[PDB]
Amino acid sequence: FLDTFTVKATEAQEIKTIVDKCHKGNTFDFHALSDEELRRLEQLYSTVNNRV
């Protein structure tokens, strides 16, 4: 149930540790400093908000 009406901690950890903070610190400013997998992050958005 919770895997279908909540996000998974593995999905969280993945991006939290590999994608977001690697960009920048004090504010996490912008995103041109990134790979093509930003598009995948966008897809992740469209999963997360469309399950929550």
Binding site: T6, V7, K8, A9
Partner: protein, 133 residues
């Protein structure tokens, strides 16, 4: 028609400009038509006063203006006689594109002056397994 414009002196045309309108009967059915006295007075700028005919009661226009008038009449007449005439006497209209462009522009400018306000996005609260639950 003739190039015979009646003199607007009261000795000839009593009560010319006493009211702001002129009226005429047209055709065999004698349809009524009202004309502004200013539209009529436009003729007396082209009227030439050296020339006077028919008991010195009618002047003549200049040929340029008189023939412009005749050509306008002829154009209206042949348009009436033809079936494929270009209705909408206004000429080639070409300002519908600009209207469409400004309409789309205002629409988009509103649509994207909205989401500057509707996405302040202070912070969010995502439930995450292990931590928020």
């Amino acid at each position: 028609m003739l190039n015979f414009i009646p003199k607007r002196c009261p000795s000839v045309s009593l009560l010319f400009g006493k009211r702001p309108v002129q009226r005429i009967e047209v055709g065999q059915a004698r349809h009524q038509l009202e004309i502004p006295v200013e539209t009529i007075e436009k003729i007396y700028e082209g009227v030439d006063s050296r020339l006077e005919y028919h008991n010195k009661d009618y002047n003549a226009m200049k040929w340029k203006d008189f023939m412009k008038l005749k050509l306008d009449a002829y154009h209206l007449l042949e348009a009436s006689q033809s079936e494929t005439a270009a209705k909408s006497a206004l000429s080639d209209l070409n300002w519908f594109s600009d209207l469409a462009d400004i309409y789309s522009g205002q629409q988009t400018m509103a649509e994207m002056d909205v989401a500057l306000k509707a996405q302040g996005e202070q912070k969010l609260s995502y439930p995450i397994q292990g931590k928020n639950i």
